[PDB]
Structure formats: structure tokens, C-alpha cells
Amino acid sequence: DWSWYAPSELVAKQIANVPFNVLAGTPIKASVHLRYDPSLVSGLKDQLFVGNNASIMGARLLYLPSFGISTTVLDGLSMAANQLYAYVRKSNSGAKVYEAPDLMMTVLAIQEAYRVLFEIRRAITFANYWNFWNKYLPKQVFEQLLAIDFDDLMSNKANYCAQFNLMAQKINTFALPKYFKSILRMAYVSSNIFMDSDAVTGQMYAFVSSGYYRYSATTSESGTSLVYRDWPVGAAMPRKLNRLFTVLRELLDAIYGDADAQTMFGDIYKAFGSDGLYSIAEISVDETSTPVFDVDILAQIENCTILEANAGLAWTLDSCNVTQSKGQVLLWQPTGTITSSDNTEHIAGDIAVALGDRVLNSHIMEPQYSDVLEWTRLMATIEFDKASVTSSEKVTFKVTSCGAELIRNVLYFKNVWNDAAEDASQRVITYFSHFSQITVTNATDDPTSAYGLMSNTLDFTQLDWHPIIYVTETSVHNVANLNSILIGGDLKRPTVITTDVVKRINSAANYALYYSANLLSNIST
Amino acid sequence: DWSWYAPSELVAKQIANVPFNVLAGTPIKASVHLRYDPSLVSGLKDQLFVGNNASIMGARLLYLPSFGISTTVLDGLSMAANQLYAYVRKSNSGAKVYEAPDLMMTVLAIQEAYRVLFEIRRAITFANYWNFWNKYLPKQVFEQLLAIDFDDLMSNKANYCAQFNLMAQKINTFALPKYFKSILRMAYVSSNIFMDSDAVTGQMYAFVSSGYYRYSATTSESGTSLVYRDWPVGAAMPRKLNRLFTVLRELLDAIYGDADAQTMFGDIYKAFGSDGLYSIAEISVDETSTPVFDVDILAQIENCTILEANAGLAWTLDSCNVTQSKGQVLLWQPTGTITSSDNTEHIAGDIAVALGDRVLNSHIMEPQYSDVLEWTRLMATIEFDKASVTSSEKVTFKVTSCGAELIRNVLYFKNVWNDAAEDASQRVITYFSHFSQITVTNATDDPTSAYGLMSNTLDFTQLDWHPIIYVTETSVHNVANLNSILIGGDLKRPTVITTDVVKRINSAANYALYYSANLLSNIST
């Protein structure tokens, strides 16, 4: 009780008055006094350390759009493709024109097209959110969290809005059944920005597609297929919007160039009414959305799994395309390669990592199956291909399973200050810091040593709900002479899931995203 | 929305109902698969690391009872003394038989006596709390968080329970006025155990006195005074109540040993009355108290200041007594010393550390003057003596100001498990990790190097609301070539307070605690 430290209320209202005028992006000039013997310390000069780091801005979740590891006809896509082509032939008659996969493929292409368009919606809808208290916001966030040239967007807010609504109308002419619960997902995921707390001065997370998908018509060998090219994103130039459109252009030029294409849409319309197709609402220069505080989404994160488990290493990713088997089964399963940050070709003396049996943390005492399902699929599993490996080789791996979005890497930003510096543009640098999910005791934020695995700058704790950090300890450091692992993260009601269990659930969850039981249940004689 | 990922009301409840079969205390069997070349790594058995540490139990806040740094005829505490004294002598016809402090001294003696009795009550009360989901609770918590021999208490509870009730009745016949706001604090602090979440599985903090205060009219020429003897506590031998009562007996039989003090007791009943005095309540046959979820207390924690800023060093603490010179001024100002882990006498090439201008974090967006005052005083300021030092010197320091508690050192604990039981009582070890408030980039949890400053065993993040960790970075590591400091901890709405601004608040806060005057414009019994 505060009443304890003051006589009358009125008197208290006067002795604790402290200003919280230290805006978001400004530096936290906190000080630590020091005392040592100058002749025994390498080069440290003063004996007073004034801070110059602002509270962390937030974190960028670079994800790979996913349909859920697909290897058998049982998996998500293949199944949906099935009931879909059905519902369509249902209303049609006569000669066959296109195979089932070739159709379903087209649909996805359209979905992934909207993915891009949506991130663009996000881009504009948020171009006007300003909240005095947080200087990061307006701009900075776009630059780092979304990877979008704010100045360019702000300066052309008019034309960009228009070019958008144009898209919305033009894409509306590309059939797409509004029943696919998967849409609702990606839509929500890349349409907002989430807060780690009900406070604006708090840090915030954002999801960002690391790429897109164009349709690649039946060449001569590979039957029709869906190609994936990378967003040139991670630590490069913070892309202007004209690049996001010029890509969408390319994206539909693909979906459209297929001889069968059009006649497909028609057949689709004949199946579901205009009321059965998705379409986004147009927006005005004034539309402004707000950061949101979704507990569930945070939880999804805290639990998730980072593919690039430790930024100290060099990661790769191939075979991300979506093909169709000789027997009409839709296939997708990304494979990658883990190598050392020095000899980009070998692994040498470094150690590859991926977690199997992982933790699951509930922020509710009595959790329930319902909450489990939701708080999961954001976490995935990686399996190594080879039994064991050599210093001269590469570490090969397949992705056994995962959720709707595959978390590739995660970066948290904060700008460091330095008033009085030559170039004005550089008195405030917005530096990033890699977030590694798996690490080791006695690790340093310098790749250089520690078997190739770096630790995380303790900054990260600023992110309430940050994903679980798993630290490995040699039998040496452990009090039980046996080596195990230490857990990091705000635990409340934790529990463990098997690599096997996770596989199960995702292999299932995704199936749901692309299926509707209601669909083939009301068709009469 | 989970409805999305559920293809059937059933199929969901079917593979989502995962178990939360991990009772807090059992090991978190999380696993990390990893691949390397056995030829280039200094001995590492398998390529699969099974977890083995349990969620952290909680943390022990070893604090030194404080009256507010006071060294002046005006530094509050003395003011308060004159204040009280006046009210007693007020309508009393006898003759000056003891000066202001002489009295005040006596009272505090009684207060501190209770601070023990209370921790004792707490011990007996909590021996009845058991929860099927926290195997730490009953036992382990006592031994580590409160430092009380459980096995000993269990064997002789009834006797201790009855003994407590007897002491209570004795204490309730000692002249301590029920109006001292300070009491209510100390009582609440050493009566409960606080959770860091509304969940029982979560971790929990506890406050524990680092010692006690004896009354003695022989120890210093200037007059009656209170001496502080260290609780032999710093992770030595987890003490039994047997010892805890024996010390209280010493304490009270000591207050009773001064003819003067008794003559005072009298003067008090004369001016306060039967019920103008404090009274601690006995304990029923059923009584059992519960861990509390007080947010304000957590806040105090997060914000507090740890004296022993980094367990990688060796700390001292003397002159903790409270004296009085020239019959009108009270004195107390603890002083300590800082040396390296090797030469308990020199400081050598290690670096002394204390924080000045610090951070203040609110978990509420709109902090009110009220919330400030409360979340404050738990944080204190330490100032070095000489401006510079030699490896052959010691690094001396005083305490500028602090709250009513003053956190000395902090340790958190977890269980580490062992399948291969070479014994039986050796297969579940309870180990501790030191928590350092100030550290440096690239520090290790090994006392070994890092200029004598340890980093924190990363699992500390399990304590949502842990104290702010201030990490310093050499201008080298910094992206701004200027050295500063990094902040760690769940920040939401932060701000900064000045060394001086902080002193000023406690100077006030503490004064408020022992403030009486408000019983001088109106008289009772």
C-alpha cells in the first residue's frame, strides 16, 4: 500500500512526481560508475558509463509462406485440390479441360498473390499511425520492421493508394473461393502489427514474407508448378513500394498466361456465386489501422521455432517450389544447408543445431486443447539427413513439418545514439541484433569463437513474450556431471511436446486450413 | 482463432489435448539434435542433448533492514524521533529522564524484534501450503528461499507453533506504538511469499533479512544503541528455527535489561493506552497462508537496486549499527568494501561497479504519482569514496540513500535431475545461480575471467519481473564507437531517475514511514 509512505494524500502527490518524458526512440541515459586501476585495464578510458541505447523498437519475423510440409496425398493441399475440383465439375458438364492439380495450383498462385497485395495494404494503412510517445513509429519501423521505404511511400501516398485499389479490382476478376480458412490467416498475419503489451511505448512484432510465388506453366518436363523466388530482403536496401507492385504485376502475368486459366475462373464462378469469392475492400488516403495487442499471437511466438536456430552459422534454403507428382499429388518440402560463417562451403569446426522435443508455455493456469492448437503452429521441426558428418562436408536437412508461416530468422532493433558526430545522418544508427533460439553457455555475440554459435545481446529481454531460448550446457558446466540444456523465457505453465507430436499436429492443422466440411454437403438431385 | 485449424469438433480434442504433465520441479526434458565432426571438438559424447533442468523455483532477496540513510540533526529519522518523544513527554509531569533518541532507540529495538518473530510466523504458516503441481513448495522453497531447515521444522512443528504463540503474547506486552507506518511494511514483507504470475507453476520471490538488531547501553560511550550481527546466511548452512527463537529471546531479554528502557515502556502506555500499541496475532489450529500475487511488489523488484551489483566480486559491510552523539541525533550509514574473488585483500585487475542514474519501468501505460512512490524505494544509491584506486588498495564505499529494505544480494534456484543415482538423496540436486545486476558484454557465469564480473546463467528470464540488468559495452562492441550500456528486462513504459532525484525521494519516503506529528493537532486517551 502506497498510503504507507506519506502522511496525507495531497503530500504524496508531490514527492513522487517523476516524468516519463523519455520518448520511445530517444536514448536511455542511464549511468554506471566504475573504479579500477588504469594501468591494469587494456583501454577503457573514463570511469563513468552513460547509456545511449533506446528501448528496443520491436522484432522482425522473417517468414517463409507455408502450406505445410506435403509428401503424401493425405496432406493438406492434395486433399483440398480434390474436393475443390469436385465442387466445380459438380456444376459443370461435358469435355474435361484441365486436371485437378493444375487447377488447385492456380488457386494458390492467386492466394500468394493476395499475400503480397496484403502486405501492401499493411504498408499504407499504417503510413499514418503516429503516437507522440514513440518516435520510432511513423518512419523507422517501416524501414526496419516492414522493410519499406517510408519517405517514398509518404511522398507518393496518393498514387500508391490508387495503384492499390486498381489491383483490388483487377485481382477480384481472378476467382478465389472465400471459404479457404487459410486466407483469413495470412490476411490477419500480414495486415497488422502486434504489441508485446497494451502500451504503445512497448516494443512490437511484425511478420514479413521473405518471398513470393509465381505460377510456372507446364514447361516440357516438370508438369505445371508453383515457383518461389526470394524477396531480396535480409539486411539490404529497405525496398520502395513501386518494387512490391512491379512484382505483383509479374505475379498475375503468370497466373494469367496459362491457356486454360480464364476458362477456369469461369468454371469457378459457375460453381460458387459472386458471393462465394474473396475480394478485398478498397481504401482511402485516410484509412489508418492501429497496432494490436493479441495475446494469442504473442503466445504463438513465445512458443514458435526459429529455423536459423543460431545466426552464428550460415543458412541456406532450396527446393521451395511446389510441384506435382507423376501421380497428381501436390508436393512441397523445403531443404536447406548449414555451413560455417567462414568457409561458406564447408562446416569445419562449427556445430549444427535444430531442436527436437521442445517446450510449450501457457500463460493460463488451466490450459485446454483449444488453446494448445492455436498456440502451436508457428513452431516447426527440422530433421538432419545424414547420420553423422565431416569437416569437409555440408550439413543437409529437410523440414519434417511446420505451420502456416515458417519462421526463418528474427531480428530485433534499437537505435544507438551519438550526438556530435561528423555525418549528421549517422548521429543515430538503427542497429539490429540477431536472435538465436539455440545457443551455448559461455557464448559471445561475436561469431569468432564458441564453436560457431553466438549468444544473444541481453537486449532481447525487453521483448515480453520473446520465443523460448534453449541453451546447451556441457557436462562440465552442469551440476549433474551430465550434459543437458537450460531454458530461457517467461515460463508460467510449461510442458513438453515430442518432435513426433508436433509433426502430427501440423500435418493436421494445415489440412484444416484448406478444407471445408460444409462444401460438399448441400447438393441436390 | 483456433476454429480455423480445426476440421472437426472432435479431431481437435483428439490431437491437441497434449498433456501438461510436467510438475514445476520435475525436469524439462527438451532436446536439441546437433551434428559436428568428433575430430575437431574437445570431447562431446552423443549428438542429442536431453534437457534436465526444472523450471526455476524462485529467488531469495537477501535484504538489510533499513531506517533510511541518516547522518544529520535533520535527516528524517531523527526528526521522527523528536516527534514521537514530544508526544510521550507531552502531558507527562515527571522529569527529563532520557533524551529523544534514547527513546526512539528503544522503540526500533522492539520493531526489529518483530521482524524476526514475523519471519518465524511466516515459516510456521507456510508449512501447510501444498500444491499438487509444485513439488518445490512444501520443502525445497524453505531451504533455499527462506533459509529454514524444513526437515527440522517438520519434526518439531507443534512445539514451535505453541512457542510462537507464547512469544507473541510476550511481544504484545512491549511498548511499540501501533501507529508507525513503517511496521505495516516490514510485516507484509516478511509475512508472505510473492508469485510472479497468477499461476502456481510460476516462480516466486521471497524477502529474507540478512541479520538482526540487538539493543545495548554498553556497546558505545555516546549511549544506548543498536548493533547489527550478520545472520550467518550467505549460502552457508540453511538454519533451523531452534536457532531463530534463541536469538529473539536474546533480543527481548536485551531490551528488558535496560532499567531506563523499561521506565520508557511505562511512559508510553501512559500516553498511548491499552490499544495504542501494536499487536501481532497468534496462530490458529487451521491457519495456513498462501503465496500472494501482489503486482506492486513485483514492480518494486524489477526496479530495485542490488548492492552486491555483481556476484563475481567479494563484498563487505560494516558500521551497520545505529548510534547517537550529543543527545539529539541518530546515526546509521552502512559502509562496505569491494575486492576480487582471489585476493580477499586487494582489488587487483578487477572492476568495481555501482549504478547511478538508473531506469524506472512501469507495466502500466499511464503511471500515476501513486504508483511511482510505491514502485520506488527498493532501489538505492551507492557512492564510491576515493575518486581513483591502485591494485594494492581496497575500493571503499558508503550508501547515499535507499528504501526501507535495501537489497543486498540475489540468488535464484532450480532442480537439476540425475537418472544414474549413485545414491538416492543425490539424484535431485538443488543448485543456485548468482544474479548480477551490472555486467559486461561477453561475460561468463564462471567467476574465472571477465575482469571479475560474471554474466548471468541465462535461465533467469524465467522470472517475469526480474530486476533491470544493466550491461556495459566497450566502445569497441558499440556501433557508435562511444561506450555506453545496454538494458535488460521486460520494459514497457520506461523512464530515468537521477542519482540525486532518487536520494531525494527516499529521504522523503522513509521520513514518511516514521512520521507521527499527525497525532499532535488532536489528543487520545
Added chain:
Amino acid sequence: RLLYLPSFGISTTVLDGLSMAANQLYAYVRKSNSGAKVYEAPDLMMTVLAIQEAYRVL
């Protein structure tokens, strides 16, 4: 006599307020305007202040 030097608030950063304010204003103007980028944020802000200071004399 209080001889004062008109101030805009010590500013030397891409964030020191005054610049923020500039971007702010600029956005609202360019907002529903179909023309093409003919001047950056400051270029504008600069003009405005000029007008302001003119008044300080008038």
C-alpha cells in the same frame, strides 16, 4: 528587455522532433495529392518556418 533568439528547439537528428514534425506536416499535404515528388519533407517545412519568422517581425 528580454533579448531572445527565436528558437525551434535544439535539433540535430533524424529524430529530434522538429524533423519529425516536418515529415508529419509534409505527409498531410502530399496525402491526397496526385502530382509527383517535387520537393522533400524539409524543403517544405523550411518554407513554412520562413513564413512564421516573417510574422514574428510583423
Added chain:
Amino acid sequence: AAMPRKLNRLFTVLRELLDAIYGDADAQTMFGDIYKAFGSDGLYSIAEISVDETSTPVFDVDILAQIENCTILEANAGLAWTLDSCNVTQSKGQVLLWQPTGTITSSDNTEHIAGD
């Protein structure tokens, strides 16, 4: 405290000021963009002065307070003060700059500080 100036000079400078703002084709093209987005009355307007108008000294307490508390740059007239770099510039089309700097010397050696 040089020569107590006449209005003659004060207008001539305003004329310079506005004819200067008008001299930038770019600036005008801006004026336009503004009316486009603010409107007839979205703009500031200073009022003319009537035949009778006469204003009075005011007793604003808040202003006095500001005074009492303020900070004088030239903290002590016993010295000699300077002040340069008062302009407001902009580098790399997105940041505004202004930070006045000065110098402090003795009343004798306008160049050194000597024993002051």
C-alpha cells in the same frame, strides 16, 4: 544597446523577407500544394488594426513565472559573448539542422579569455 532603431528599417526588412520567400519557384509551387490541402480558412491570418485600437500592458502570472525560472545565455555581462551557426539547414533530403554555438572571451582581449 547600439542605436534604438526606427520602423522605417523594420518594414524594409520584412519586405526583404517576403520578397525572399516568393523568390523560390519551388516555394510557390508549395504554397499551392498547401491551399489544396488546407483551404481558405485552414490558413493563419493576422488581423488589421482599427482606427481606435490600442492595447494594454497585461498582468500574466504564468509569463512572469517563466521569467523568474528562465536561463540567461549571457550568464554574466562582465564577459564578451558570441553566437554563430544559427542558421537552419538540411542534409540528405530528410533531416533539419539548427544548433547555435558561441564563444566566451574577456572584456579586454576580445580574442583570449585570459584570467577570467
Added chain:
Amino acid sequence: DWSWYAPSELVAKQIANVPFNVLAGTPIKASVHLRYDPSLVSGLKDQLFVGNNASIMGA
């Protein structure tokens, strides 16, 4: 009839609202691109002529 060239009540107000940001007196920055052979023309700097005269005031 403009209704014709407007696909949306919005998209129109979106890219048609051009500014009439040229106050009579300011210069009409109209431009004429042009290509020639520098060898056969008596000195002509660039190949882009930016306008520079304002609308006529009066007579």
C-alpha cells in the same frame, strides 16, 4: 462524361486530383524534350527545355 473513365468513385479522386499549384506569376515549368546532332547546331546546351515564363499578367 467523366463517369466513363472512372472505374471507382475512389480511384478517380485518387489519381485525378492533380494540383493547380501554379499561382499566376510563378513560372510554368513545362518541358520540351528534343533530339539533334550537336555538330550541326550553333550551340545548344541540353536536350531538355524547362519552362520559365509565368502566365501573362495583362496589358
Added chain:
Amino acid sequence: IIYVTETSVHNVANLNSILIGGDLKRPTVITTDVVKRINSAANYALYYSANLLSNIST
């Protein structure tokens, strides 16, 4: 407020400090840093526009 400095000599405490001048009533002290922080804000407030971005006019 006139701030007058006294040499440890003139001081009754052999430690040098400063004397305060001006009709004080209810005083208090602000930090160099605490002051900067306020104007950094105050000034920003002056030229703050955004509050005309969640709603449009004419």
C-alpha cells in the same frame, strides 16, 4: 533566479557551493538532463500535427 557562487573560503562549511537569489516560495531542482528531456518534448509538441491525420478536412 540569481545564482551566486561562494569560494570555500567565504563558506561556513569550508566546502565551496552556491547561494540562491530571488523570491523563493515553493522551490525544487531539475537536472541538466531532466531539463533537456522536457524541451525535447515541449518543442515537439508545438509543431505537432499528426492529430489531423486520423480525420480529414475540406
Added chain:
Amino acid sequence: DWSWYAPSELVAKQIANVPFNVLAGTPIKASVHLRYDPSLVSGLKDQLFVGNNASIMGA
């Protein structure tokens, strides 16, 4: 008018909050930074003066 230096009331209530916790008789630790040439000044040692006089009690 204070309304001038803040957007919403609520936001202001947060940026000016200053404590007046400097009790009567305590010292007014106000500081004056200094800069001179040590070799030309009799005996003054530091270049920073922290106050230590409380507000006058009375007369």
C-alpha cells in the same frame, strides 16, 4: 496557455511531472559549470559548483 505545448491533456500530465520533494531545510543542490585556466586562478579547485544552502528559513 499550457495547452500549446502538448497534443492531448493526458499526454501533458506525463511530460512535465516534476517532483518538489526538496524539503525546506535540505540543500538546494543546484550546479554551475566553470571553465578557467588553473594557473591563473588563486586556489579554486574543481570546475563544478554544487549548491549546499537551503532556502532561507526566515528572519
